[PDB]
Amino acid sequence: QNLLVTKRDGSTERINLDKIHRVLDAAAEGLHNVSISQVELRSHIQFYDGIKTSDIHETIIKAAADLISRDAPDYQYLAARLAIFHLRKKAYGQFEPPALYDHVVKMVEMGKYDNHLLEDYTEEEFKQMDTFIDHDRDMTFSYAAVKQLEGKYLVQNRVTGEIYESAQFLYILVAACLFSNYPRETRLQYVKRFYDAVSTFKISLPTPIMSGVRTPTRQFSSCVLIECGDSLDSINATSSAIVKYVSQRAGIGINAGRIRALGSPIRGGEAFHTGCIPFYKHFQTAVKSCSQGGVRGGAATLFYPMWHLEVESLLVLKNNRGVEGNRVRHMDYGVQINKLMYTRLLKGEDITLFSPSDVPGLYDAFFADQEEFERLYTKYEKDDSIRKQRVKAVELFSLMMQERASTGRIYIQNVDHCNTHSPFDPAIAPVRQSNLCLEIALPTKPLNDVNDENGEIALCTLSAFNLGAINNLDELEELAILAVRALDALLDYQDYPIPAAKRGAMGRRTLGIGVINFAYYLAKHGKRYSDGSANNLTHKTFEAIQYYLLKASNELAKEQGACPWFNETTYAKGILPIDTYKKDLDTIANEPLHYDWEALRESIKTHGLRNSTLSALMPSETSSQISNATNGIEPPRGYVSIKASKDGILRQVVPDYEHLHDAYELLWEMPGNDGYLQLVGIMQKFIDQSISANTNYDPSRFPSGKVPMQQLLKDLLTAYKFGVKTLYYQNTRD
Amino acid sequence: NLLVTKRDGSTERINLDKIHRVLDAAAEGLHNVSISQVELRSHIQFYDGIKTSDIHETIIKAAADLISRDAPDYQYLAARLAIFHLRKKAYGQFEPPALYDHVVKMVEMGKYDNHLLEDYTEEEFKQMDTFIDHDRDMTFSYAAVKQLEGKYLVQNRVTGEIYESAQFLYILVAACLFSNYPRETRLQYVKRFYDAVSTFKISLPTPIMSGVRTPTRQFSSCVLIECGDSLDSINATSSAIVKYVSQRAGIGINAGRIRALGSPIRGGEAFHTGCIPFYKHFQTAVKSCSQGGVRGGAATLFYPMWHLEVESLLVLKNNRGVEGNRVRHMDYGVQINKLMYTRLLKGEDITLFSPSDVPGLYDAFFADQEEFERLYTKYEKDDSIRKQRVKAVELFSLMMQERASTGRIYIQNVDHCNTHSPFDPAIAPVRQSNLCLEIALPTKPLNDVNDENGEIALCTLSAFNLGAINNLDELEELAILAVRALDALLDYQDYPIPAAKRGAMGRRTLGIGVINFAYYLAKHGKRYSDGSANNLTHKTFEAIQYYLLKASNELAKEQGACPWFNETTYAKGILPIDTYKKDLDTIANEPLHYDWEALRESIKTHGLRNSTLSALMPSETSSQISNATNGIEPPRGYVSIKASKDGILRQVVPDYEHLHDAYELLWEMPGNDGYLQLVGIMQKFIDQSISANTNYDPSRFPSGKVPMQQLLKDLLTAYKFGVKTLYYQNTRD
Ligand SMILES: Nc1ncnc2c1ncn2[C@@H]1O[C@H](COP(=O)(O)OP(=O)(O)OP(=O)(O)O)[C@@H](O)[C@H]1O
Ligand SMILES: Nc1ncnc2c1ncn2[C@@H]1O[C@H](COP(=O)(O)OP(=O)(O)OP(=O)(O)O)[C@@H](O)[C@H]1O
Ligand SMILES: Nc1ncnc2c1ncn2[C@H]1C[C@H](O)[C@@H](COP(=O)(O)OP(=O)(O)OP(=O)(O)O)O1
Ligand SMILES: Nc1ncnc2c1ncn2[C@H]1C[C@H](O)[C@@H](COP(=O)(O)OP(=O)(O)OP(=O)(O)O)O1
Ligand SMILES: Nc1ncnc2c1ncn2[C@H]1C[C@H](O)[C@@H](COP(=O)(O)OP(=O)(O)OP(=O)(O)O)O1
Ligand SMILES: Nc1ncnc2c1ncn2[C@H]1C[C@H](O)[C@@H](COP(=O)(O)OP(=O)(O)OP(=O)(O)O)O1
Ligand SMILES: [Mg+2]
Ligand SMILES: [Mg+2]
Ligand SMILES: [Mg+2]
Ligand SMILES: [Mg+2]
C-alpha cells in the first residue's frame, strides 16, 4: 500500500486514510446501523496508485450507495451527505457556500440568474436573506434526491457538467423571485416563511419551477388544455397551439369530440367528411413535432364522448395490431361518460351512436345539463331522419375496458360529475375535458385562430403539500397562505405564448395544489387502503386542505382583489364543495366537519376568491423523490425502489421503514381496488378539480391468470358511484 | 315472344328492330363496324322482364368490348350509344331542351350559379343556343364519354342522376369566364371559345370543366408554399396546406430553410429536433382531408442537395427503416445547381451545411451562382462552421438509387430555373416547384396563415391539342381564347388565403401546355429517339410561346399589364430566346419564324397581362376527353386497358389505322437521350418547367439491372441541354 494520490491542483501526496475516515464520520452524524469500516472495506480495495482525490470521493459515495438496504435504511442519507460534499467542491471549491449577494452577482454576470434579482433587492436585503439560509439542511436530502437535484434542479452547465449552485440557494431565490413584487413592509417576511416551508420539504414544487424561477427563462407552463372546434380554422388553430406549447415542454389536453364523424355532409353536401382519424394523426405529429424521433419529447391525451359515431374506431387506436391507416398509437385517450351511458349498461340496453353535427344541442348539454341531455338523447333516438348506429351497452363498455386493459392508457372521465360537483357554473363556463394525467378540470373555449382572443386555453400551476412533513392539519393554514400567494404571483411572472391561454390564466387564475407522501401519512396513523380504515382520516385531512386553501385565497382576494371571472364560479353564488358532493359518500364516511365553512361561505360571497380552483391531486414521481416521499397518493410497489442510472444503481427506501415496515400496505398486497376508489371518492368531495386515480389488477389473484371483464366493469361502476371524476392508468402486474 | 320492361313501369314484347334502329344511328360514318356482331353478343344476354335501361347498357358494353386495333371505330360506336342514354337520363329524350329553359331549371334546382341569369338576358341565351351544336357529342370516344359521366357532367352524387349534356358544359363554361366582357364582344368571345373547347382544340383542367357554372368558386388546383425557419411559419404552412388540400389541390412544399438537427435556438436555449418530425406534420396536413389518409391530396417537398440532413431526407420513401425516420406518403424534389454537378465530374466531395450556419448561401443558391461558389468555398475553408464531407459520387448515387426504387424522388436544377427564367432572381427568384414539377413561380414564406406579406404561388392550367390543329398559325386564335379565359378565371375564383391572392393578382401567372404530342410527331412522320423531331419541336413550341406572349401582350394593351410585371425579365426586354441553354444550338438548326423583335419592344412598352404563360404539365384526365396522348409523353401501347366500375374501358391511340407504324411506343425507344433532347428544346421557349419523365427497361440491360452509370449519364445529359426538372422515372416490370 502507501500509494500516492492526485490532488485537484495537480499535486501529489501519500495516501491518508485518516482524511477519508474523517469525512465519513461527518456524514454519518445521527445515522443508525451504519458501518464506516464496511464502507472503507469496499473503498480501499478499489484504490490504485495515482488515483485522483475526486475519484476517491465518488468511490466512497457509490460504496455507501450500494449499502442502501431495508436492514439499514440510513445509508441513503450517508451516501447523500457524501454527494452533497462533492457538489460543494464542484461549485464553490470549498464546503461552506459564499455570501448570498456575492453568489448572485457572480452568477448574473455569467448569465445564469435573472438580473431582476439585483434590481428588486439591494445588497443589504441580500445580507438579511442570507441569514435565513440554513445550509446544514442539505444533509436532509436522500441519495436519490441528490441525484435528482444534480441532474434536474440545480443550475449547471449542460456542456461541461459543472455545478454552479447548491440546494439552499435554489430555495431562497425561488422565494425571492416569487415575492419580489411584494412591498418591503412584508416582502422579506414572506421570503423567509416560504423558504423554510420548501426547505423543510413541507411544500413540493414542480420541476419547471425548481429549475427555472431564478433563471432568465419564463417558461413555467407545463399543463395545457385545448378544445378543438368542428372547423378547419379551429383544427389549424388547435394544431398550431399544440406546436407552440410542446416546444416549451408542456402536457397537452386535446378535446376533439366536436369533430363531426365520417360521412357527415359539409356545406349542405358540397363535400363529405373523411373521418376524425386523419385529423387525430395531424394532432399527434403536432405533439411529436419537437421530439427527436416522434416517440419521446411531449405527449398528449385526446378526449371524445362515448356516444360519438366513430367511438368503435377510436377506442382501438392504441393496440399494436391493425394497420397504420387506422391507428394513432403515440397519444393517450379519455372516453367521456355520463349517467345515461351507465344506465344503459346496468339495464343492459343499447347505446345510440350520434355524430355531434347531426344532433343539435346534444353535445353542449352532455356536459352542462344532464336532464336536457337525456331529453335530447331520447328524442333523437326516436327520430328516423337523424343518422345513427345501435350498439349494445355491454359490448361497448367491454371494448373500452378491453383496450384499457391491454394498453393501460385509455382513460375515463365522468363529465356529469365534473359539472354537478364543480367550482364552475356549467351554464357559463362548463368543464368539457381534462389534461394529460386527468387531474385538471378547467373551462375551455375553441379557437378560430392561433391568436384568437375569443378562445380560451386552460392553464394551471401545480404544487403539493407534504403530509409526511407535517405534525398536524393546522399547519396547513400557514402552508396554504405561502403556497397560494406564491403560485398566484407566478401567474403574473410567467410568459404566455398564446393569447387565448393568457385569457384563461389571468381571467380565472386557476391553481392546482395536491399532496404527496399519502401512503406514509396513513402509516403514521396506522391506517390502510383496502380495509377502509382511512376513510374518516381522509375526510378529516382533505377538509383541512380545502378549507385552509379557500381561506388563504379568500384573504388574498381581500388584499389584491378577486379574479376577474369569479362571477362564473359556483363560489360566487355561495356554493361550497360540501354542498354538491356525491351523497353516496355518506355511507362510507361519518367524519364531521371540523371547520367553520358557513363563516367561510359568507366571506367568499362578499370578498370572493383570488383563484377559481385551488386543489388538484396530480401524480408526482420526480418531485416526490426530493422529499423522499411516496408517489402522490399512490401506494409504493415495494419498500425499496430500484432505478438504474448514469452513476450506477440508485436505491430509495420508504420514509421511516425502521418503525413502519409492517404499517405500510404495498400495491400488490391489496385485495382489490374497492378500498382505494373509496378513498379517492372521499378526497373528491373537497378537491376542486380531479384526481389521477389509478386502477390496479394482479392476474395471479384471478383464476386462469386473467382478469375477468365483470371485475373491470364492477370497479368502473364502483368509482362512478362515489363521485370519482376521472381514472388514470391501469397498472397490470407482470 | 319475350317481354321487356319500359321506363314508366309498363311492359312490351321485345322488338329487335328498335335496337337495330338505335345501333344504325350510332354507326353513321364509322368504318369496319359490324351491327350484327353487336346484336349477336347482345341478344344472347337478354331475358324475360328485362329493363330497357339494362338493354341499353348491355349493347353499350357489348360494343365497348369490340374495341380493338383491327376496328378502332368501335370506340365511337359505344360512345354515341353512351351519349344516347345520357340524353335520356338528363332530358328524358334525345334532343336537349332550350338553353334558357335549361339554365332556369338548373338554377331553380341550385345546380347552376344564379349569376348566369343576372349577366345574360333571355335573348342572349337564345343567341348562344344557336352556337350550340349538339351533334358534337358524337365526336367523343368511349373513354371520353365515361370520363364525362363520372367527373365533368353536373350530377347528383347521391342518386346518380345526370343533369346535363356535354355541349351545355362547354357553352356555359365559356359564358361564365367571359360574362364580364363588354356587350360589343362578349357573345363574340363566347362562341369562339365554345368552338375551341368543343372541337377539342383547347383542353381545360378538371376543376374548370366540373366547376365553372356551378355555385362553387374553388378552381385552384396548383399551390406552391415556401416554409420559413420558424414555428410561426411551420404552423402557417401547415394551416395553409390543410385549407388547400380540402379544395383538392396539389401542394408544393419548400422546407429547405428549416435548420438541420442539432442547430442551436436563441443562442442555445434549446436545440433542434430535426426536419423529419416537421415533415411528418406537413404530411398529415396533406392527408387531413383524404379518405382513409391514403387518397385525397398529395404533395412534393423540396430541399437543397447541400442540406446537412440530405442523407436522411433522400431515404424517406423506401419501404425499409423504422417509422421514426420515414415519411413515405409524400414525393420529394432534390435541388441541384452547377457546383454540385461539377463536384460529381471531378469526383470530389460535397460539403453539407445547415442553412442557418451559412449566411446568404441559400439565397445565392437560387439567385447568384457566382456568389454561391464564393460563399460555398469560403464556408468550406471555415472550420468554425459545422459541416460534413461526403463524396459527390456517393451522394448522387444515393439520390438516384432511391429515385430508381421509388420513382418519386425528383430533381430540380435551380440554376436553370433562374438563369433561364421569366423572373428576376434578385427580386423574385424561383426557389421551388409543384407536385408534378412543371411549375416554377416565385414564393415567399408566411409568418401567419393570414400574412399579407407572404406569397403563395398559384397557377391556372390549360393545354393546346396539337392533334386537333391543322397548322401552327391556328395557335394565334387559340392563344387569345386560352389566355383571356384563364386570366378572367383569376378574377372569378376565390382565394382562401391572403398570401395566395397576392401572388395571383400580382403576377397573374398562367400555365398552358400541350397534349397529343406523340400523335403530333406521328402525323409528321417523326420520332423521339432518332432526333428527327428536334427541328419540328423547335418550330412548334416557338409558335406556342410567341402566340401565347402576343395574346397576353395585346391583352395588356386592353386591360393593363399585371401589377408586378416590373419583377419580370420581360419588363427589361429579355425573351426566352435570349437566355436559353446554348448547348441546344448543337441539336437544332431550325430558325425563328416569327417577329420576336417587334414583340420585344411591344413588351417593354405595354407589358404582359401574365408573368408566365407556358408550362408543360401531365394530362391523364383531360387527354382522354380529346382522345389524345398523355401530354408530351409517348404511349405505352396502341391500346390502353383501364378497369372501371362499368367494366374494362379501352382506348385506342388517335388515327391508328393510318399511323400504326408511324407511332413510337415507350418501350420501343433505345434510351432517354432522344427524349431529353426534345424536352430541352421545348424548355427554350417554355416559361416555367416541364414534367419530363425518364424511362428504363431492365431487359435492355445486362444482368437485368439498370447500371448507375446510365442513370447519371441521362441526368447529366438532361442538365446539359438546360432541362429544369425531372418527374417520374418509369421502370418496366
Ligand atoms: N466542515 C466540514 N464539514 C463537512 N464536510 C466538510 C467540511 N469541510 C470540508 N468538507 C468536505 O469534506 C471533503 C474534504 O474536505 P477538505 O478539503 O477540507 O479535506 P481533505 O480533502 O480530506 O484534506 P486536504 O486538507 O488534503 O484537502 C470535501 O468534499 C469538502 O466539501
Ligand atoms: N334522332 C335520333 N338520333 C339518335 N338517337 C336518337 C334519336 N331519337 C332518339 N334517340 C335515342 O335513341 C334511344 C331510343 O329512342 P326512343 O325512345 O325514341 O325509341 P325506342 O326506345 O326504341 O322506342 P319507344 O320509346 O317508342 O318505346 C334513346 O336513347 C334516344 O335518346
Ligand atoms: N491525501 C489524500 N489521501 C487520501 N484521501 C484523500 C487525500 N486528500 C483528500 N482525500 C479525500 C478526502 C475526500 O473524501 C476526498 C475528496 O477530497 P477533496 O477535498 O475534494 O480534494 P482535494 O483535497 O484534492 O482538493 P482541495 O485542495 O480543494 O481540498 O478525497
Ligand atoms: N374537403 C374536405 N375534405 C374532408 N374534410 C373536410 C373538408 N373540408 C372540411 N372538412 C372537415 C373539417 C371540419 O371538421 C368539417 C367542416 O367544417 P368547416 O371547416 O367549418 O367547414 P364549413 O364551415 O365551410 O362548412 P360546414 O357548414 O359544414 O361547417 O369537415
Ligand atoms: N319493346 C322494346 N323491345 C326491345 N328493345 C326496346 C324496346 N323499347 C325500347 N327498346 C330499346 C331502345 C333503346 O335501345 C333501349 C333503351 O330504351 P329507352 O328509350 O331509353 O327507354 P324506354 O323506351 O323504355 O322509355 P321512353 O318511353 O322514355 O323512351 O331499349
Ligand atoms: N422547443 C423546440 N424544440 C424543437 N424545435 C424547436 C423548438 N423551438 C423551435 N424549434 C424549431 C423551429 C424552427 O425551425 C427553429 C427555431 O426557429 P424560431 O421558431 O423562429 O425560434 P426563435 O425565433 O425564437 O429563435 P432563432 O433566433 O434561433 O430562430 O427550431
Ligand atoms: Mg481536500
Ligand atoms: Mg363550419
Ligand atoms: Mg324509348
Ligand atoms: Mg427565429
Author numbering:
A (entry chain B): 3 to 736
B (entry chain A): 4 to 736
Quote from the publication.
Class Ia ribonucleotide reductases (RNRs) are allosterically regulated by ATP and dATP to maintain the appropriate deoxyribonucleotide levels inside the cell for DNA biosynthesis and repair. The α2 subunit houses the active site and the allosteric sites, and the β2 subunit houses the di-iron-tyrosyl radical cofactor.3−6 On every round of turnover, these subunits come together to form an active α2β2 complex, which allows for the transfer of the radical species from β to α, affording ribonucleoside diphosphate reduction. Excess dATP inhibits RNR through the creation of an α–β interface that restricts the ability of β2 to obtain a position that is capable of radical transfer. ATP breaks the α–β interface, freeing β2 and restoring enzyme activity.
We reasoned that substitutions of either F87 or W28 with Ala would create room for ATP binding in site 2 regardless of the position of H59 and thus be independent of the presence of ATP in site 1. In other words, F87A and W28A substitutions would be expected to uncouple the binding of ATP to site 2 from the identity of the nucleotide effector in site 1. First, we wanted to determine if ATP could enter site 2 with dATP in site 1 in the W28A construct, so we grew crystals in the presence of a mixture of 3–5 mM ATP and 1 mM dATP. The resulting 3.40-Å resolution structure revealed clear density for two nucleotides in the activity site, but the identity of the site 1 nucleotide was ambiguous given the low resolution of the structure. Due to the lack of clarity about the identity of the nucleotide in site 1, this structure could not be used as evidence that a W28A substitution leads to site 1, 2 uncoupling. Unfortunately, attempts to obtain a high-resolution structure with ATP and dATP have so far been unsuccessful.
